[PDB]
Amino acid sequence: PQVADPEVAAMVRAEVEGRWPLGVSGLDEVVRYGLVPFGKMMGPWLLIRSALAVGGDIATALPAAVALECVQVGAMMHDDIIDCDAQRRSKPAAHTVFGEPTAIVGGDGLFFHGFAALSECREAGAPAERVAQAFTVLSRAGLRIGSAALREIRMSREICSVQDYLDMIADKSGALLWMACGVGGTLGGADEAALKALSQYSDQLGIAYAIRDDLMAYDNGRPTLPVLLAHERAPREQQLRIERLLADTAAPAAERYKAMADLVGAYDGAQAAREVSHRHVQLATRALQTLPPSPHRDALEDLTVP
Amino acid sequence: GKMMGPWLLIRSALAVGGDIATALPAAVALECVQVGAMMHDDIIDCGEPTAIVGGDGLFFHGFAALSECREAGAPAERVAQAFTVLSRAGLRIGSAALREIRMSREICSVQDYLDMIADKSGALLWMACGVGGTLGGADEAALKALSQYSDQLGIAYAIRDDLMAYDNGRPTLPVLLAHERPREQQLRIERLLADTAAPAAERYKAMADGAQAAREVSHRHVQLATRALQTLPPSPHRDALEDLTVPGRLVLEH
Ligand SMILES: CC(C)=CCC/C(C)=C\CC/C(C)=C\CSP(=O)(O)OP(=O)(O)O
Ligand SMILES: [Mg+2]
Numbered sequence: 001p002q003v004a005d006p007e008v009a010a011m012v013r014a015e016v017e018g019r020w021p022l023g024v025s026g027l028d029e030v031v032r033y034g035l036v037p038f039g040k041m042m043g044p045w046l047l048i049r050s051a052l053a054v055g056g057d058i059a060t061a062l063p064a065a066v067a068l069e070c071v072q073v074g075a076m077m078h079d080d081i082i083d084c085d086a087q088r089r090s091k092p093a094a095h096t097v098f099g100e101p102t103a104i105v106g107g108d109g110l111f112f113h114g115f116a117a118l119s120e121c122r123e124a125g126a127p128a129e130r131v132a133q134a135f136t137v138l139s140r141a142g143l144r145i146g147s148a149a150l151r152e153i154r155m156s157r158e159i160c161s162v163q164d165y166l167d168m169i170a171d172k173s174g175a176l177l178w179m180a181c182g183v184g185g186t187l188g189g190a191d192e193a194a195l196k197a198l199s200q201y202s203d204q205l206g207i208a209y210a211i212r213d214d215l216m217a218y219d220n221g222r223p224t225l226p227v228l229l230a231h232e233r234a235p236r237e238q239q240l241r242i243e244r245l246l247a248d249t250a251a252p253a254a255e256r257y258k259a260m261a262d263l264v265g266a267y268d269g270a271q272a273a274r275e276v277s278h279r280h281v282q283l284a285t286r287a288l289q290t291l292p293p294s295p296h297r298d299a300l301e302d303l304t305v306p
Numbered sequence: 307g308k309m310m311g312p313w314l315l316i317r318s319a320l321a322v323g324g325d326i327a328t329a330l331p332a333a334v335a336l337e338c339v340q341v342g343a344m345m346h347d348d349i350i351d352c353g354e355p356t357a358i359v360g361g362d363g364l365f366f367h368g369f370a371a372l373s374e375c376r377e378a379g380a381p382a383e384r385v386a387q388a389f390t391v392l393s394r395a396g397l398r399i400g401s402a403a404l405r406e407i408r409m410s411r412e413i414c415s416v417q418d419y420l421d422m423i424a425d426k427s428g429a430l431l432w433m434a435c436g437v438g439g440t441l442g443g444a445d446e447a448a449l450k451a452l453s454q455y456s457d458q459l460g461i462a463y464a465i466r467d468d469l470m471a472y473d474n475g476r477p478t479l480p481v482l483l484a485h486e487r488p489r490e491q492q493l494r495i496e497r498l499l500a501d502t503a504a505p506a507a508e509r510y511k512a513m514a515d516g517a518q519a520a521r522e523v524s525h526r527h528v529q530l531a532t533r534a535l536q537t538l539p540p541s542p543h544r545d546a547l548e549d550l551t552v553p554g555r556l557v558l559e560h
Binding site for chain 1: 343346349350354355356358359360362363365366367369370372373374376381382383385386389390392393394396397400401403404405407
């Protein structure tokens with residue numbers, strides 16, 4: 001290869017740890033609680049690779065990667081307030097620890113640390129025209145995620161078309177990926193064709209990740225793709241009860257759950273979901289081939305492979 | 307009546323030689339941030355799910371539309387600085403709001419109270435002045451004037467909100483300024499809001515029984531707010547900014 005290959009996920013952690021280190025107080029303490037433990041940090045990792053994949057600078061993509069981390073943690077800290085399915089492995093919710101008002105302010109401080117970190121990209125050398133278009137990309141993507149999250153709450157206990165669900169999770173998971181790739185590609189100086197490719201890669205990989213989440217239950221009241229594909233195939237009589245249990249509000253969820261795995265298994269909803277997920281992974285790798293060959297494009301391609 | 311920020315942003319932009327076609331989409335953008343911020347304020351004061359996410363969405367709308375000022379013809383170098391100004395203002399408010407939740411049931415220092423409302427109310431106005439002035443092409447001296455003006459105007463109106471209750475129970479400047487001026491009445495002031503089991507309508511009358519001092523503090527900041535305007539060049543927009551200093555006839559409700 002002609003370009004280098006850094007260790008992205010470890011570099012971002014050093015930058016976030018530097019900005020909000022151990023021992024912070026005030027609002028920084030609530031910001032740090034949301035950030036740590038760090039974990040994979042795939043969002044920021046995706047932005048830097050997307051920036052470097054088109055010729056960008058690490059120094060320009062780095063503050064935007066912190067911005068990506070802050071916005072994602074801000075959205076997670078607020079989503080924990082309105083949604084409550086506490087997996088016994090889930091990190092204790094910030095509202096459980098600090099109280100609901102502090103989780104509200106804390107998530108907002110994370111959002112504005114994001115905007116402030118993205119504002120620093122100008123100081124890092126990016127042209128002012130690029131920083132503003134990055135904010136436009138960042139802002140529009142966040143609006144897609146927000147709109148999808150609300151329809152996710154509203155569409156619970158209801159059966160929807162399979163295509164509506166795909167459009168649903170694309171605006172939540174795909175926009176979450178596009179926000180990293182679109183801002184990374186923008187600051188890297190990508191032309192319109194590369195940004196469209198990174199947009200296609202984001203949408204297609206985002207569908208795959210969303211389906212993968214539906215599958216770990218089978219490998220809430222939320223409609224999932226295996227149930228939806230199973231409903232599509234089941235004859236009329238099984239379709240009604242599939243609808244009536246999800247519509248049901250006063251029947252044990254544990255029995256509705258196991259009475260749902262029976263329908264998904266009977267009509268191969270789980271396997272049908274993998275093939276749909278497989279179809280979109282192939283479209284994601286296809287989209288990447290537009291980008292110039294590099295280790296960064298290789299890193300983005302490997303990410304599709306489970 | 308309405309929020310000072312939209313009007314305050316436009317006058318700030320035009321007072322430094324700015325364009326109206328730039329300030330108009332920006333003030334719309336500025337409203338989105340403030341309106342979204344208030345949606346979250348209604349939750350810390352106690353539908354909540356739609357209010358949380360919809361409040362978040364208005365922040366993104368504010369920055370999207372602030373970037374949209376490139377469509378209005380604004381120099382991208384000014385818009386870039388507007389992002390920096392707006393972002394640091396939200397950080398000041400968030401730190402101030404956090405201190406507020408952690409100030410209840412406790413008498414604080416006056417200087418600690420002024421900085422809180424300065425970082426809360428002043429930065430909220432600075433969120434309007436600073437963004438507006440930036441998109442108007444102000445130099446560093448004008449932006450300084452707008453900073454001190456917004457901080458001093460925010461304090462003054464924050465006190466006026468404190469007075470309106472006397473003519474809830476979180477400490478206000480009159481309660482504090484009354485405390486600082488005997489030892490026994492220092493205790494009496496502290497216990498009642500710390501107190502958790504008592505009639506609210508009575509601790510209200512018992513607390514009323516410093517407010518005039520709050521007006522002198524408020525007046526001192528109105529002068530500082532007006533002095534900061536002198537750093538700006540004389541114009542109708544600067545005169546309109548002096549008009550807002552005198553209380554006038556506003557809503558005066560939350
Ligand atoms: C992180 C962030 C951006 C904001 C956190 C704080 C929130 C949610 C709202 C603050 C509202 C402001 C800035 C001023 C109204 S004080 P007032 O006395 O005029 O009226 P009020 O107290 O709002 O009734
Ligand atoms: Mg309030």
